[PDB]
Amino acid sequence: KKGFPFSIFLLALLSCITVPVSAAQVK
Known part of the structure; x- marks a missing residue:
């Protein structure tokens, strides 16, 4: 289309707003 x-x-x-999410789950 x-x-x-x-x-x-x-x-x-x-992709830019999901980079620091990994660090938020490991802390």
Whole structure:
């Protein structure tokens, strides 16, 4: 389908906000 590529920024942003989550579970 041809629309808007916004999910790429959501997934890219999700990868940035999911880096410190591992450190939150180990502490």
